[PDB]
Design a protein around this ligand. Structure first.
Ligand SMILES: [K+]
Ligand SMILES: [Mg+2]
Ligand SMILES: [Mg+2]
Ligand SMILES: [Mg+2]
Ligand SMILES: [Mg+2]
Ligand SMILES: [Mg+2]
Ligand SMILES: [Mg+2]
Ligand SMILES: [Mg+2]
Ligand SMILES: [Mg+2]
Lengths: 212, 205, 214, 60
RNA sequence: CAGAAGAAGCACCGGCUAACUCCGUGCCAGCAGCCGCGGUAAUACGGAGGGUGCAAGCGUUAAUCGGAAUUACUGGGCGUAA
């Protein structure tokens, strides 16, 4: 069967392929190139774990210094097939997850987006919140809504660890009888889809959730 | 070391009034005595022999407000004491100062009596005693403190005691607010509802 | 443009009180907010410490919004405030005078008071850099990292190539490629990844503040 | 000896110092001991609200 | 003298065994003294509501005797169960 890889893994594969290729573009020493070729080849193999003939063919094209961006795209498209898409919950199930928010509305998510979505997040302007649904290490769907800043600033996003247009996201603790509550949050990309594509490690997102 | 939760729930579990309220109003008006506490209280499950023995022991504890450890020690004393263990056990609980104050009518409830005893409002033989577990011997005189006589609660409690049946073994005087433990209560004097044998059996288990 | 951020070096408890007449209506908002340093990467943390009757419940969210906006604005060079915990330990109000805006202004005033006593410091982004080059040019690479104020954590040899791992400020990192090509004679490659935000050198920080001032 | 790690998830690695207690695990042959959660290197189960003392979880 | 003020938790709820539902998960994750439970309507897993038992403790582990008339003196057996 075709290898199954997580979306964050595919993003890493894309990044390493671009990194691997950029070496061919810049590095003039074959020796240095070779060292990186092996490193990247191993990394791609490691993610797949087992490499089929189709992966091997792609790897062969990747190893060649005459690799082209058009060829890279084709290789990525093949690798995209190996990726497994994020499972959308049933609309009923979603409402069960967001019990507090009655009649929660979900926008249509692109299948490709789902395929590359480590987590799914959607922003409602009326809410002024970002609704994030994701499967944890336990693989239970976890849904959380927190206030998203209307102001957008350029800074490193906590989730993806990449510099992008970020808006502060705050998650409120359950209100006590006194009415006291604690909000903990960090700057994150306003666009979840962009952040998903940027994210190469599932753990980084998990860490952000831990901070909340 | 005391139960500070809802009183009527305990009565509802037993399905009988445990005299955990003054009795100014009917228990039925206050709560649904018939129905057991909680969501599944309305349904009545079949009770095992162990369950029946347990519930009897729990009833008595809830009436006298004694925790299990102290109740176990009473049982052991009752077993050590000569005669009927079950009757001895009931006599020991009756012997408690807490019960005596309530029975004399100084306290509306045994919990109220406990606060009176605890707060040094009770004197036994002219000496202040603040132990609820204190055992009142025959011929002992339990008198409220002179300072405590002025308290409104004591007066109201005595009126409620008039409505209740007067214990034969206790002689009390209103106004004077003193009482004498003439004799240790006989089993006949105590309510027949309590089944002492079940408690004795449970501890033999 | 390096995306510098600000944080409070020292924890401080401050009271922000606003009292003024606007449009023929008196406006009075008082908030006593404690600002403390937060763990790196923790982000902004707000705690409501109002039991009640000291701040109107409606104005509390507005107070939080004011603080959030003020953090975005920045207190020093205008860089977004990060790694700060805000706690509304005390407050005072007048029913008629108190308004959402007034309390929001008061929160801003409190944060200004905090900024005075919190010893805020600018934070520069630090990028972890892995450089692969021949051992011959390794000494030159070491020098370049030192010049850029970067510190080399460790050095790892892979075959003929030598791998250097160092943390360099992003500002210093710009133009590393051209230098690397010159140092290695185009025989070396590098990869940089953001790690954390670290305090700017005081001398540099002062200059940055002056630059943003004018 | 072999010791079962109770609860959902663990942080145990090789060279981790743990405290073991008596308790066989039927269905796992040769496992006669349980590792005490919340003792030494072993950590309590995250997001556990019932039987916390058994899984070394402090009061939420 | 002042003021309810300053003072409640832990385990358990399939049967044995006192105490039940909902939701999630779907032979997974897990539970488990024993018998067992979990493959899409789980009182057995995890959470919640309700309940039960104890209470400044409550559970767990280890350890001894008991139940064990299962070394039988009290007080067992031996055709076919040893
Ligand atoms: K014999
Ligand atoms: Mg005690
Ligand atoms: Mg039962
Ligand atoms: Mg189910
Ligand atoms: Mg034992
Ligand atoms: Mg024997
Ligand atoms: Mg035999
Ligand atoms: Mg045979
Ligand atoms: Mg034979």
């Amino acid at each position: 069967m075709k290898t199954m890889i997580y979306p964050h893994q595919y993003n890493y594969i894309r990044s390493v392929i671009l990194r691997l290729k950029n070496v061919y573009k810049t590095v003039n020493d074959k020796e240095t190139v070779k060292v990186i070729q092996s490193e990247t080849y191993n990394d791609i193999n490691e993610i797949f774990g087992h490499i089929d003939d189709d992966i091997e063919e792609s790897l062969k094209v990747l190893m060649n210094i005459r690799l082209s961006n058009k060829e890279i795209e084709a290789i990525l498209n093949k690798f995209l097939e190996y990726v497994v898409p994020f499972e959308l919950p049933s609309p009923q199930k979603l409402q069960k997850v967001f019990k507090k928010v009655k009649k929660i509305k979900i926008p249509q998510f692109e299948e490709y987006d789902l395929k590359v979505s480590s987590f799914v997040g959607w922003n409602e302007l009326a809410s002024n919140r970002k609704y994030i649904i994701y499967y944890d290490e336990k693989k239970q769907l976890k849904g959380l809504y927190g206030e998203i800043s209307n102001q957008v600033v350029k800074g490193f996003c906590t989730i993806c660890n990449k510099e992008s247009n970020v808006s502060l996201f705050m998650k409120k603790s359950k209100t006590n009888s006194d009415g006291q509550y604690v909000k903990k949050g960090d700057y994150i990309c306003r666009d979840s889809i962009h952040c998903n594509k940027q994210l190469t490690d599932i753990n980084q997102f998990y860490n952000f959730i831990d901070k909340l | 070391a005391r139960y500070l939760g809802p009183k009527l729930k305990l009565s509802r579990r037993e399905g009988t009034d445990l005299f955990l309220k003054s009795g100014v109003r009917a228990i039925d008006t206050k709560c649904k005595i018939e129905q057991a506490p909680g969501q599944h209280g309305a349904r009545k499950p079949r009770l095992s022999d162990y369950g029946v023995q347990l519930r009897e022991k729990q009833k008595v504890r809830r009436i006298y407000g004694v925790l299990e450890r102290q109740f176990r020690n009473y049982y052991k004393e009752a077993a050590r004491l000569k005669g009927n263990t079950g009757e001895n056990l009931l006599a020991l609980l009756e012997g408690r100062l807490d019960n005596v104050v309530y029975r004399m009518g100084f306290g509306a409830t045994r919990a109220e009596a406990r606060q009176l005893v605890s707060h040094k409002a009770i004197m036994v033989n002219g000496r202040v005693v603040n132990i609820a577990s204190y055992q009142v011997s025959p011929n002992d005189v339990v008198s409220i403190r002179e300072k405590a006589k002025k308290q409104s609660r004591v007066k109201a409690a005595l009126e409620l005691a008039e409505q209740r049946e007067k214990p034969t073994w206790l002689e009390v005087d209103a106004g004077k607010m003193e009482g004498t433990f003439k004799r240790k209560p006989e089993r006949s004097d105590l309510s027949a509802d309590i089944n002492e044998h079940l408690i004795v059996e449970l501890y033999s288990k | 443009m390096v995306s510098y951020r600000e944080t409070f070096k020292s924890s401080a408890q401050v009271q922000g009180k606003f009292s003024r007449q606007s449009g023929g209506r008196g406006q009075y908002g008082d908030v006593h907010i404690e600002f403390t340093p937060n763990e790196t990467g923790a982000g902004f943390e707000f705690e409501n410490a109002i039991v009640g009757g000291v701040v109107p419940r409606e104005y509390i969210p507005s107070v939080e919004a004011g603080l959030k906006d003020a953090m975005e604005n920045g207190v020093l060079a205008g860089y977004p405030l990060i790694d700060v915990k805000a706690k509304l330990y005390d407050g005072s109000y007048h029913d008629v005078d108190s308004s959402e805006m007034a309390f929001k202004i008061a929160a801003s005033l409190a944060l200004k008071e905090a900024a005075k006593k919190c010893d805020p410091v600018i934070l520069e982004p630090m990028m972890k850099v892995t450089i692969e080059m021949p051992e011959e040019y390794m000494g030159d690479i070491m020098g370049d990292v030192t010049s850029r104020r970067g510190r080399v954590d460790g050095m790892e040899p892979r075959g003929n190539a030598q791998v250097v791992n160092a943390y360099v400020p992003l500002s210093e990192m710009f133009g590393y490629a051209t230098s690397l090509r010159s140092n290695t004679q185009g025989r070396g490659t590098y990869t940089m990844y953001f790690d954390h935000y670290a305090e700017v050198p005081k001398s540099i920080a002062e200059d940055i503040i002056k630059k943003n001032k004018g | 000896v072999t010791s079962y790690i109770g609860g959902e998830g663990h942080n145990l690695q090789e060279h981790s110092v743990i405290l073991i207690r008596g308790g066989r695990v039927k269905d796992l042959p040769g496992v006669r001991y349980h590792t005490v959660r919340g003792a030494l290197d072993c950590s309590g189960v995250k997001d556990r609200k019932q039987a916390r003392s058994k899984y070394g979880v402090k009061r939420p």
